[PDB]
Design a protein around this ligand. Structure first.
Ligand SMILES: Nc1nc2c(ncn2[C@@H]2O[C@H](COP(=O)(O)OP(=O)(O)O)[C@@H](O)[C@H]2O)c(=O)[nH]1
Ligand SMILES: [Mg+2]
Length: 167
């Protein structure tokens, strides 16, 4: 049983760091912001062993058959902003609209992720994101790629969203 996951959001929010933290269980200081790649890992989620197939997006212009394939056949999306980055939060709607158009549906499994919670300089409050998440009817999860806080929860919640959708 496989789950095909796509991580989207503005550049610099932590899409790469979150993916690598899940896959390789370390925090990456620098990862080329223009590199888009997929990552696979066998995980156990609520006692069910599955394969996660995750595309870490970089939003480049060059055609990628893989990118298209993941957008078309992708089962769930992580929409990521950073809590210290107001612009990244404002951009969330763009990503949501993109996803809805790709999937031609309102009911796409999706989790709103507020990354960099380890930082004190918060400009996007919890209530704001909760309200947005509620508006979309999707779960919101606070994360830190840096400390691993909520990293499993974010990806695992999305899988649970996918399972719900499956019936
Ligand atoms: N403090 C902090 N820095 C983070 C966190 N996640 C990522 N970063 C840093 O934010 C920058 C951008 O991260 P990256 O994973 O390349 O973002 P992407 O452009 O969305 O792929 C890098 O300098 C990371 O080290 C986090 O949870 N906390
Ligand atoms: Mg990246």
């Amino acid at each position: 049983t496989e789950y095909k996951l796509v991580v989207v959001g503005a550049d610099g929010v932590g899409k790469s760091a979150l993916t690598i933290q899940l896959i390789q269980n370390h925090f990456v200081d620098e990862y080329d912001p223009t590199i888009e790649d997929s990552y696979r890992k066998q995980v156990v989620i609520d006692g069910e062993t599955c394969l996660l197939d995750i595309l870490d997006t970089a939003g480049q212009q060059e055609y990628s058959a893989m990118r298209d394939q993941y957008m078309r056949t992708g089962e769930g999306f992580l929409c990521v902003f950073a809590i210290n980055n107001t612009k990244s939060f404002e951009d969330i709607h763009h990503y949501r609209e993109q996803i809805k158009r790709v999937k031609d549906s309102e009911d796409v499994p999706m989790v709103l992720v507020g990354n960099k919670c380890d930082l004190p300089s918060r400009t996007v409050d919890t209530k704001q994101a909760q309200d947005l998440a509620r508006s979309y009817g999707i779960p919101f999860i606070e994360t830190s790629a840096k400390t691993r806080q909520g990293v499993d929860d974010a990806f695992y919640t999305l899988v649970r969203e996918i399972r719900k959708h499956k019936e």
